[PDB]
Amino acid sequence: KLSKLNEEDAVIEKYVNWIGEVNERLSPHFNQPTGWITLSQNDLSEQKDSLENVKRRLDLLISVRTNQLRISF
Amino acid sequence: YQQIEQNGIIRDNQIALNEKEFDSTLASTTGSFIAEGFKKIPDKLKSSNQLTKRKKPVTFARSAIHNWGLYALEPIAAKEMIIEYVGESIRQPVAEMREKRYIKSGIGSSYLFRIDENTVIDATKRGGIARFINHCCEPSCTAKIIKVDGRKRIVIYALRDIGTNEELTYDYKFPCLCGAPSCKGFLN
Amino acid sequence: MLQFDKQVLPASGKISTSCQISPDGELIAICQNTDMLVYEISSSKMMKLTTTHKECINCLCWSPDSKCIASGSEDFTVEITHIIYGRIRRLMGHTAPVISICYNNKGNILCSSSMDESIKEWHVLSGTALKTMSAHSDAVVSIDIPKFDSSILSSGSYDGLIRIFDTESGHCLKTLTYDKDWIAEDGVVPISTVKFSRNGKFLLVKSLDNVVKLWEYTRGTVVRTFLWPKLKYNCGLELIYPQGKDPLVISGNDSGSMCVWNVYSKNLVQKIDEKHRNSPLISISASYDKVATLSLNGECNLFRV
Amino acid sequence: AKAKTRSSRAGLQFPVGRVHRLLRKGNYAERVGAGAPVYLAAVLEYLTAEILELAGNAARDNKKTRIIPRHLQLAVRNDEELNKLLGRVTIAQGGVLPNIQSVLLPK
Amino acid sequence: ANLLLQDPFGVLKEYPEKLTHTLEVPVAAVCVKFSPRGDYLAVGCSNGAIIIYDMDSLKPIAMLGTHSGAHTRSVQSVCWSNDGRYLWSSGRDWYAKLWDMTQPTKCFQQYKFDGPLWSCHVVRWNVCIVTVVEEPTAYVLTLTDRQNAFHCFPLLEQDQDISGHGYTLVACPHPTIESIIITGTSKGWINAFQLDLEDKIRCCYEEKIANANIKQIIISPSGTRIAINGSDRTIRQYQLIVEHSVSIELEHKYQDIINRLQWNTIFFSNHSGEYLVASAHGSSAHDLYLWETSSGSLVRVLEGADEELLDIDWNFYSMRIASNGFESGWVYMWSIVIPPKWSALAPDFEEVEENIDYQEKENEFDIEEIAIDLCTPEKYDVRGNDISMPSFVIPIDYEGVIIQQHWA
Ligand SMILES: C[S@@+](CC[C@H](N)C(=O)[O-])C[C@H]1O[C@@H](n2cnc3c(N)ncnc32)[C@H](O)[C@@H]1O
Numbered sequence A: 001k002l003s004k005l006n007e008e009d010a011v012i013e014k015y016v017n018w019i020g021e022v023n024e025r026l027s028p029h030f031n032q033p034t035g036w037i038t039l040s041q042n043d044l045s046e047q048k049d050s051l052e053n054v055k056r057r058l059d060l061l062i063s064v065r066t067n068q069l070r071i072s073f
Numbered sequence B: 001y002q003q004i005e006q007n008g009i010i011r012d013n014q015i016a017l018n019e020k021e022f023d024s025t026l027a028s029t030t031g032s033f034i035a036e037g038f039k040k041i042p043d044k045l046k047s048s049n050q051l052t053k054r055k056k057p058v059t060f061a062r063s064a065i066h067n068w069g070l071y072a073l074e075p076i077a078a079k080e081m082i083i084e085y086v087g088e089s090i091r092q093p094v095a096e097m098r099e100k101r102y103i104k105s106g107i108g109s110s111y112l113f114r115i116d117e118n119t120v121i122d123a124t125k126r127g128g129i130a131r132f133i134n135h136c137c138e139p140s141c142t143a144k145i146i147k148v149d150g151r152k153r154i155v156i157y158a159l160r161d162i163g164t165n166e167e168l169t170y171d172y173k174f175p176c177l178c179g180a181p182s183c184k185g186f187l188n
Numbered sequence C: 001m002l003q004f005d006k007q008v009l010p011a012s013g014k015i016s017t018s019c020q021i022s023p024d025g026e027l028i029a030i031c032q033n034t035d036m037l038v039y040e041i042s043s044s045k046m047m048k049l050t051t052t053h054k055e056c057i058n059c060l061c062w063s064p065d066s067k068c069i070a071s072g073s074e075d076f077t078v079e080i081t082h083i084i085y086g087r088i089r090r091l092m093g094h095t096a097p098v099i100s101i102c103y104n105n106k107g108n109i110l111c112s113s114s115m116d117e118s119i120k121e122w123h124v125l126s127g128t129a130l131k132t133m134s135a136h137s138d139a140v141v142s143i144d145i146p147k148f149d150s151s152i153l154s155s156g157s158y159d160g161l162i163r164i165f166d167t168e169s170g171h172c173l174k175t176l177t178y179d180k181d182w183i184a185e186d187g188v189v190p191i192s193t194v195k196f197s198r199n200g201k202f203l204l205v206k207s208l209d210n211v212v213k214l215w216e217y218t219r220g221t222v223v224r225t226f227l228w229p230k231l232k233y234n235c236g237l238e239l240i241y242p243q244g245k246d247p248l249v250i251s252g253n254d255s256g257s258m259c260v261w262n263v264y265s266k267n268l269v270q271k272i273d274e275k276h277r278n279s280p281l282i283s284i285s286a287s288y289d290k291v292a293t294l295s296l297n298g299e300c301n302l303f304r305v
Numbered sequence D: 001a002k003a004k005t006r007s008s009r010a011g012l013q014f015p016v017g018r019v020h021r022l023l024r025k026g027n028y029a030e031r032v033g034a035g036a037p038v039y040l041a042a043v044l045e046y047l048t049a050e051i052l053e054l055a056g057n058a059a060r061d062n063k064k065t066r067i068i069p070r071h072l073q074l075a076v077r078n079d080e081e082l083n084k085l086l087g088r089v090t091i092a093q094g095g096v097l098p099n100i101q102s103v104l105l106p107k
Numbered sequence E: 001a002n003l004l005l006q007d008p009f010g011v012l013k014e015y016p017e018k019l020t021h022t023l024e025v026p027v028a029a030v031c032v033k034f035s036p037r038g039d040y041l042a043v044g045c046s047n048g049a050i051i052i053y054d055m056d057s058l059k060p061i062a063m064l065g066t067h068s069g070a071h072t073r074s075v076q077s078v079c080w081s082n083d084g085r086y087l088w089s090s091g092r093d094w095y096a097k098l099w100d101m102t103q104p105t106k107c108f109q110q111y112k113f114d115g116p117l118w119s120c121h122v123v124r125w126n127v128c129i130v131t132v133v134e135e136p137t138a139y140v141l142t143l144t145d146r147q148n149a150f151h152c153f154p155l156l157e158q159d160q161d162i163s164g165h166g167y168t169l170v171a172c173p174h175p176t177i178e179s180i181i182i183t184g185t186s187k188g189w190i191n192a193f194q195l196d197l198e199d200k201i202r203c204c205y206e207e208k209i210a211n212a213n214i215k216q217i218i219i220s221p222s223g224t225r226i227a228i229n230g231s232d233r234t235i236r237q238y239q240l241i242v243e244h245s246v247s248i249e250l251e252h253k254y255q256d257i258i259n260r261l262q263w264n265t266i267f268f269s270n271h272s273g274e275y276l277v278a279s280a281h282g283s284s285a286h287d288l289y290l291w292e293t294s295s296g297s298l299v300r301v302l303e304g305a306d307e308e309l310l311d312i313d314w315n316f317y318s319m320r321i322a323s324n325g326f327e328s329g330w331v332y333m334w335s336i337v338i339p340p341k342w343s344a345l346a347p348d349f350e351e352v353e354e355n356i357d358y359q360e361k362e363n364e365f366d367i368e369e370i371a372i373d374l375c376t377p378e379k380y381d382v383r384g385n386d387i388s389m390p391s392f393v394i395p396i397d398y399e400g401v402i403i404q405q406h407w408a
């Protein structure tokens, strides 16, 4: 069961897969004309996804509260 | 027991890291709060309309001398009016009764004043904020009596350059709980 | 009108100070000595939750959405803990110990009492010293934010001050009784607990003389008095709400005698004296319809309309 | 408020009639605008109000009712802004600001 | 609201006079909009953030633009709902994000626009009229039963031309009808648009007042007064007659005779709009203005700032004026101060402003069951507001509050 932690590890892994298998297709959404104020969406692969690659600093920090908790009893 | 011992190191040396909250002089607080001891003790551990347009932004707060005192909220210069004294006007026989009637019940503060020798300015129930400043034998304020259009208001100037939140003084000229050494040990 | 439902806790044990239900109506926190028990009333389970306090916990507070529990004890801790996530913030700002606390009715400002004649404020995310309320002459027991809107802060203290402050800037705005002076001869009884009502338009007091009054803060006088036909305790007050006409007030005596007063008229219909007969009572709080109790001995009796 | 006496249309106590005369036969520029004596009479009201506020203010300290010229120098030199405005000036029969250099004061 | 029940003797003002806070926000802003109560200030920031402020401690609670839908370019205008639950945010990243503070970091539904924007205005909490740049109709975007079908409803009849009037740049809804939308063209003319909430619209009112780019149209909250800010130096407040059937007439004209500045934003008073504010455009104009809307005179000036103030907001509960000083970027804020009272030290003091000559009576020489109710909340404050609607409290972030000691 583990019904107090897996709600986080559904939503920590939602960053990996449910955010993953939807927001991976933004990078082939540049691919409509060919392989800048028209279509300025190129820097948000690493500026709006800057927090997405810094989400690993925090999504394991949610995933180590039970590392503090399951050793606490 | 195996649970609580492994939770022991969560509160034996990790209670030595977190409990660093000593910041006072470490007073006698070992008595339990399920006892509810009263301790009714005087211990102090804290650090202790015409003339309206011309006044200063001084506030009242808990005094460094006594119960309540005024705190000058700007660097006042040498001779500027802090506050006009405001209150009642009642003469000497009616204020003779009130001088004892409040202390018959026992308030314990001389909230009168004198303009001329016949009449006083009462400040027990009514008054201004000018009443709140207390006695110190070393002066930082005086109160000259000026006249404004036939009737004499009482106006409290400064003597010296009072600073920001420097607590004002006043001489009364009829113990000294100011804490000052260079003073007479009484009021009189 | 009112009856007894269930009692699950045993009497004897450690120091028990506050019993507190979250305002959702289901999740109860019982302050034991450096411990908090969680009693879910729906399926009748238990849960123990211990916090990083050192000393005997006096303050305990609940979230308006039941997501965080703030406490406070006398080693200058100002502690806000989470329901499962742990210790959140530790403010450590008063130079005196702390008796009781409350919340802003949005949930951002846990208010705070210091016994050295000052009352201060903390923000959760800022964590800094917001405001200073230095207007007091004694150690301060209870500061009750009213239930509906978070505008005014009523203060209770050991000298006799029914004093009402500001939250927006932090100034004095009302005082209903006098202080130690104005008779200066022991005429003013000290105050144990000030409480607001559901609306917040009526204020409730229990004093050291064990006399209960329901203050109208607005006019300046009182409209109710509730006698016991001397206390040495910090006991609590509550206004239980039935669905009918009259919500009864409840406070606790030196011992387990607990009358409830009609407040609309002034008579005394019910009294729960069957329990707590050895046990001297500090704290009471309620739910929509589930009211708990506590004493030095931890008896949590639930009730129902 | 009124119609006659333009000062009363503006709400001043200084005349805007006289100031509009003294901007033409003083020969300051060719064609003085209509808003120009209004703005100038308001400023000369305000600086006269700023002095005579502070003049009778230090008339009260002296305890006298009327203002002598000695009160005007005590209103001007004690105030920094006014002092800057009246830097060059000497107010006739007006004394000085009471100060001693504090090296000369005794031990 | 119980602080104003205890603060004065009973006199409370109808505009703030002094300025007591200043939000130290170093990245600059474009728009400042409060909540429908005084608690939350939405700040439309310059780079593309939205740094929402709790108006009790001057330090924020959230940032809309973390999870999904952050503005890449600047954010132009914002409004709030009836209860303060949602946010409708118009920006220069060609995106109108309806946010919801139940999930206080993620958008709900966006729209890739054809270009930048000017403003937004909500009628209901979902439907929102946006001003697409260089468009002579207003494609009002509605969140329908499905979120995806943003019906680009063209706010124009199929025959009617505003050829010679330019584009529509302002659209502000009526307060009291909630279905007739007043819009103003880029050249002079003013239309009305009665949306049926089907999609029939009637051009009931058309006119031209003066040839200018209408920067802003506001309506007083009693639906009586309507003020127009052109691209020339005038403010024309008009009176509104809607029973539909609409006609306006000239009430007053407000100008700066001295410097001839442009008025950036204008805003009205609470009940019937008895006071009009404005913020001028040119430098050395350092102050918001006030005007008595009947007499017309410059009655007061909010002399608190040091820069030029761009946008404005007047929430009526806290009586504050929030305004971004455009040069530095900081949000200037005015507030009605309340001075303290020593009259509440004991239950009988009195603060009389003059030495009263109390008459001498004889006494100086001599030696319940009211009705009690506990159930109802309050109904009207001292200001006389729509109070007894317990507002949508924005919940604080109880998803990651434990993290907020470590690394934002
Ligand atoms: C003229 S009233 C002063 C105002 C009063 N302390 C207040 O703030 O409300 C006299 C009071 O000042 C206090 N007082 C008189 N002389 C004092 C002194 N030398 N040092 C400290 N307090 C003094 C006395 O306790 C008396 O109650």
Ligand SMILES: [Zn+2]
Pocket (backbone or CB within 6 Å): B136, B137, B138, B176, B177, B178, B179, B180, B181, B182, B183
């Ligand atoms: Zn002394």
